[PDB]
Amino acid sequence: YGIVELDPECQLQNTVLIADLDTEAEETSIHSTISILAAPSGNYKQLTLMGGGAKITPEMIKRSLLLSRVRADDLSTRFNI
């Protein structure tokens, strides 16, 4: 997961949590990131917090942990392995 601050001078037509980083644009410009290894049981095996950009708040951590569980539940049961 990644955390970015919305820049007022870039709007078309205040932090945001982004899930599953892809594309050069996100890998290059997002310096606050979270990596999780979550077991479907409910516990966690790995939790990496790297805050080089926006401040990593407890809310951002909790939301990430929640999504990691939801993602883990999906990946574990999907392919019946």
Partner 1 sequence: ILLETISVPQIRDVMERFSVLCNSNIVTNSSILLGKILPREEHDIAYSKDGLPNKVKTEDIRIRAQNFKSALANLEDIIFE
Partner 2 sequence: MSVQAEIGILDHVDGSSEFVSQDTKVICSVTGPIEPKARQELPTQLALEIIVRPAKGVATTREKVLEDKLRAVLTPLITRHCYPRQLCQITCQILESGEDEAEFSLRELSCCINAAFLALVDAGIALNSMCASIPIAIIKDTSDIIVDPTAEQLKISLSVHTLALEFVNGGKVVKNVLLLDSNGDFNEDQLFSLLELGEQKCQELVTNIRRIIQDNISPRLVV
Partner 3 sequence: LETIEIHPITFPPEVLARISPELSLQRHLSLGIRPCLRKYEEFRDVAIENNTLSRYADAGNIDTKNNILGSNVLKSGKTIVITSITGGIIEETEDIIANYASVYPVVEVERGRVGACTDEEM
Please report, as residue ranges, which positions from 29 to 48 form the binding site for partner 2 (by CB under 8 A).
Answer: 31-32, 42-48
Q: For residue 31, what is the DSSP state?
A: -
Residue 71 makes contact with partner 3 by CB under 8 A: yes
Q: Is 13 in the site for partner 3 (CB under 8 A)?
A: yes
Question: Hunting for tokens 């870039």 — which residue is that?
Answer: 10
Q: ∠ CA 15-35-60 to the nearest 5 degrees?
A: 30
Residue with tokens 């979550």: 38
Which residues form the interface with partner 3 (CB under 8 A)? 4, 6-7, 10-13, 16-20, 22-26, 28-30, 67, 71, 75, 78-79, 81
